[PDB]
Amino acid sequence: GAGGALFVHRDTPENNPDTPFDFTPENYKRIEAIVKNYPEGHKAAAVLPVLDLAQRQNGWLPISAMNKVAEILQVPPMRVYEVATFYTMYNRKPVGKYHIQVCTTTPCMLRNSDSILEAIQKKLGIKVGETTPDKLFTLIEVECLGACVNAPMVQINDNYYEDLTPKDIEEIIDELKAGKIPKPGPRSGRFSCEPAGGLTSLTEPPKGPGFGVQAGL
Amino acid sequence: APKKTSFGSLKDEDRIFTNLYGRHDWRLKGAQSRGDWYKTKEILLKGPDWILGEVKTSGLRGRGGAGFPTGLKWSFMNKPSDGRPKYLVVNADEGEPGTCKDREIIRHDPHKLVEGCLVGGRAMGARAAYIYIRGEFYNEASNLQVAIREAYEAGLIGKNACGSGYDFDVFVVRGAGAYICGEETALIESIEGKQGKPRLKPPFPADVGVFGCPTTVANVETVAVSPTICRRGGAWFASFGRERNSGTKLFNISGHVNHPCTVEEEMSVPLKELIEKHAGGVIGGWDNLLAVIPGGSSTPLIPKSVCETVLMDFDALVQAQTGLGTAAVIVMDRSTDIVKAIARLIEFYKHESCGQCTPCREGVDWMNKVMARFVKGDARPAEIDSLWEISKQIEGHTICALGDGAAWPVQGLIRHFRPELEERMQQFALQHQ
Amino acid sequence: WSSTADPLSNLVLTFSTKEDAVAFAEKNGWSFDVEERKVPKPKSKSYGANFSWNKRTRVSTK
Numbered sequence: 001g002a003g004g005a006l007f008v009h010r011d012t013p014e015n016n017p018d019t020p021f022d023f024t025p026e027n028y029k030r031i032e033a034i035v036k037n038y039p040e041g042h043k044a045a046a047v048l049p050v051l052d053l054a055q056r057q058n059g060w061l062p063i064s065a066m067n068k069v070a071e072i073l074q075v076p077p078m079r080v081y082e083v084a085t086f087y088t089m090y091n092r093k094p095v096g097k098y099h100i101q102v103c104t105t106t107p108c109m110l111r112n113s114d115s116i117l118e119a120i121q122k123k124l125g126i127k128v129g130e131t132t133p134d135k136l137f138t139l140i141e142v143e144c145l146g147a148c149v150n151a152p153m154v155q156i157n158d159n160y161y162e163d164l165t166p167k168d169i170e171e172i173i174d175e176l177k178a179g180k181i182p183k184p185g186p187r188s189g190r191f192s193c194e195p196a197g198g199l200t201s202l203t204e205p206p207k208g209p210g211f212g213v214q215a216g217l
Numbered sequence: 218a219p220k221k222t223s224f225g226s227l228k229d230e231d232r233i234f235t236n237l238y239g240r241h242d243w244r245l246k247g248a249q250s251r252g253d254w255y256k257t258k259e260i261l262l263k264g265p266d267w268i269l270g271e272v273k274t275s276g277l278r279g280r281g282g283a284g285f286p287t288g289l290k291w292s293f294m295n296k297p298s299d300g301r302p303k304y305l306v307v308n309a310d311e312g313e314p315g316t317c318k319d320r321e322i323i324r325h326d327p328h329k330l331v332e333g334c335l336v337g338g339r340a341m342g343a344r345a346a347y348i349y350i351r352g353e354f355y356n357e358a359s360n361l362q363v364a365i366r367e368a369y370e371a372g373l374i375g376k377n378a379c380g381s382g383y384d385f386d387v388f389v390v391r392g393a394g395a396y397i398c399g400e401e402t403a404l405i406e407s408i409e410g411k412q413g414k415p416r417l418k419p420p421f422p423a424d425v426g427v428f429g430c431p432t433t434v435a436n437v438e439t440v441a442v443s444p445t446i447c448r449r450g451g452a453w454f455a456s457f458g459r460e461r462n463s464g465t466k467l468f469n470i471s472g473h474v475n476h477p478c479t480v481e482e483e484m485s486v487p488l489k490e491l492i493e494k495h496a497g498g499v500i501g502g503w504d505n506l507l508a509v510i511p512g513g514s515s516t517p518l519i520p521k522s523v524c525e526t527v528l529m530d531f532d533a534l535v536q537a538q539t540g541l542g543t544a545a546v547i548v549m550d551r552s553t554d555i556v557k558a559i560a561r562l563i564e565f566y567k568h569e570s571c572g573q574c575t576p577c578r579e580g581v582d583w584m585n586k587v588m589a590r591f592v593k594g595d596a597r598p599a600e601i602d603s604l605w606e607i608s609k610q611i612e613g614h615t616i617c618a619l620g621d622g623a624a625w626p627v628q629g630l631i632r633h634f635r636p637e638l639e640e641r642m643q644q645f646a647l648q649h650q
Numbered sequence: 651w652s653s654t655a656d657p658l659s660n661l662v663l664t665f666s667t668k669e670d671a672v673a674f675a676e677k678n679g680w681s682f683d684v685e686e687r688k689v690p691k692p693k694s695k696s697y698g699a700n701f702s703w704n705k706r707t708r709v710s711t712k
């Protein structure tokens with residue numbers, strides 16, 4: 001589908017260069033640590049980590065934060081604009097407290113991700129582009145979060161919830177809005193990508209060090 | 218009896234990723250108990266030439282999906298230094314639909330990846346290793362960071378790595394939601410704080426790479442098997458699989474199977490054996506199977522008549538007008554709308570294009586619109602050949618292989634299910650008068 | 651409208667070489683000015699220079 005969000009910034013009272021943003025001293029220490037991970041003369045390599053840290057501190061990315069990152073890294077603001085508008089994990093508009101991302105790619109689609117999307121829709125009463133009136137949940141559609149084996153799966157604030165049934169995701173939503181912390185992972189009684197059939201492989205105890213080592217080493 | 222003709226049924230002791238399911242301690246102590254970091258100092262002291270020779274004898278091909286010979290590719294960094302530093306880049310972006318192996322390698326066997334990074338960096342003379350992992354894998358990246366900290370404290374990496382006298386650093390760099398950033402040149406751009414747009418080759422990363430320095434980009438699975446290959450030797454790895462298809466492989470089986478899972482199996486195992494052995498078989502029985510995408514969304518699908526006798530290696534699947542890819546098996550039964558699935562894949566490719574070059578940027582969106590119309594049946598039969606020609610134009614005329622990965626599924630669908638498209642068009646024409 | 655009184659305002663001749671034009675002008679008795687042909691100089695293009703380790707040729711965007 002066509003991307004709803006625009007790629008031109010128009011100043012608003014909520015979002016304009018005079019919007020107050022700054023990094024906390026702990027965040028400045030983290031920025032120093034991040035910058036020391038690249039060779040001298042290549043400070044611009046830290047644009048993505050520092051921008052992500054700004055988003056993690058603020059929740060989203062106002063243009064003031066992007067200008068601040070450009071100023072800290074001595075990078076022209078247009079390059080930071082390019083980075084922020086290229087990568088989809090950056091939020092250039094405010095999002096809810098829990099950003100719900102449902103994978104609808106073909107491997108997840110085959111395992112009825114439509115049921116999960118509809119269950120979330122009828123539990124929250126919002127669409128796949130809206131935010132709840134209490135500003136708690138934002139629901140969007142994403143592409144292949146990397147857990148195709150555990151389809152259908154959903155990501156909520158860098159946490160994975162997979163092997164989902166509509167009732168399971170509704171319960172997760174209830175305990176999320178109740179202030180609890182839901183345990184990330186599959187909900188079907190399997191811990192990880194192992195087969196649910198009974199662990200067809202890797203049954204024997206793992207071999208000790210140097211077991212298969214060749215001679216002359 | 219030399220020259221094996223039947224492949225598969227791999228034993229546990231021959232497996233490399235002995236903690237694929239996270240059933241053991243992923244920390245340093247568990248990895249050491251499982252054979253990791255064992256006389257790796259002796260491996261480093263053997264010199265880059267010995268490691269490169271072992272990798273070449275192993276016959277390892279790139280596990281990222283292209284199947285390039287790992288030894289020949291790594292030998293490109295065996296040049297004398299010209300004043301610039303040398304770097305190793307580990308590709309952990311893992312963008313293909315259907316692929317889940319690198320996530321498990323990172324989350325459950327991180328010390329394997331760290332030791333492979335050290336061994337490969339010593340082999341190619343790299344000063345440090347940058348691990349580029351997708352930003353969706355936050356817990357996986359934090360586990361990797363914990364493992365790297367454990368290795369640093371134990372003296373396994375850093376100054377005087379493992380007592381070998383070779384200095385090596387391991388860095389973790391997180392991207393922000395970009396499937397194109399898995400391509401090696403696009404990944405290099407993403408590391409340097411720029412847009413994830415691929416670079417034209419030449420120059421190759423061995424000449425001009427990250428920060429303009431000689432660089433090698435290698436998949437997580439390719440890196441994580443090198444220490445075990447060097448420990449047991451090239452010959453042991455070589456025996457498994459067909460000739461030029463050596464070693465073990467990680468397989469992700471999803472879609473319409475009873476037990477979708479990630480399993481480790483020998484290379485040339487037949488697809489039917491793998492599906493009925495580890496995945497629990499096709500939902501509704503084997504006779505209910507309609508089509509299989511063997512190597513992730515970039516590889517063309519094959520119908521049931523091909524899946525019952527095909528082998529899961531590069532050459533066999535190439536002979537089947539498809540590719541091994543990332544060994545990501547997606548299974549669809551006869552209840553599946555085959556056109557809708559390919560349309561969803563094309564939508565994925567339309568949303569993942571970086572837009573740098575004309576053929577991908579416009580043609581992929583054009584094919585997305587055409588296939589969206591195809592799903593409803595609004596088009597005409599000549600548009601099938603039109604779409605085939607459009608795909609041909611996109612293929613081989615783009616900067617990177619994302620255009621290839623968008624074109625190939627369309628070609629496979631047109632090749633194997635043209636009557637379905639024609640029938641849907643005829644139904645639309647009837648119903649809409 | 652735009653008016654003119656010189657009959658030669660639209661006359662343009664094409665020649666394969668400078669000497670042919672000079673000879674035509676001389677035999678027709680016209681005073682001429684000749685300007686030497688300008689050719690763009692050959693240039694050193696290198697795609698790898700966009701990504702230099704230490705030089706200023708490194709690009710900030712693509």
Ligand SMILES: NC(=O)C1=CN([C@@H]2O[C@H](COP(=O)(O)OP(=O)(O)OC[C@H]3O[C@@H](n4cnc5c(N)ncnc54)[C@H](O)[C@@H]3O)[C@@H](O)[C@H]2O)C=CC1
Pocket residue numbers: 279280281282283284285290310311312313316399401421422434512513515540542543617618622
């Ligand atoms: N694991 C994953 O998440 C994904 C994997 N893929 C796979 O990636 C494949 C295409 O990737 P490409 O890099 O475009 O294939 P490629 O053949 O062009 O390159 C593969 C590796 O070999 C090197 N290489 C190739 N030719 C070389 C040469 N003549 N000289 C020196 N080095 C050379 C390349 O630098 C690269 O590192 C696809 O077949 C796809 O299956 C695609 C998307 C995602």
Ligand SMILES: Cc1cc2nc3c(=O)[nH]c(=O)nc-3n(C[C@H](O)[C@H](O)[C@H](O)COP(=O)(O)O)c2cc1C
Pocket residue numbers: 278279280281282283284285287290308309310311312313396397398399400401434435436437439617618619
């Ligand atoms: C669009 C695109 C995306 C890719 N994404 C990945 C990826 O996420 N992970 C990966 O290992 N390789 C990916 N690749 C293939 C890389 O080129 C490959 O991993 C790299 O050359 C490493 O080579 P190797 O297989 O010898 O390790 C991608 C290729 C393309 C064209």
Ligand code: SF4
Pocket residue numbers: 397414415569570571572573574575577578615616617618619620
């Ligand atoms: S083929 Fe697509 S993704 Fe690759 S460089 Fe061209 S526009 Fe970008």
Ligand code: FES
Pocket residue numbers: 103104105106107108109143144145146147148151153313314315316
């Ligand atoms: S298809 Fe859902 S995680 Fe990839």
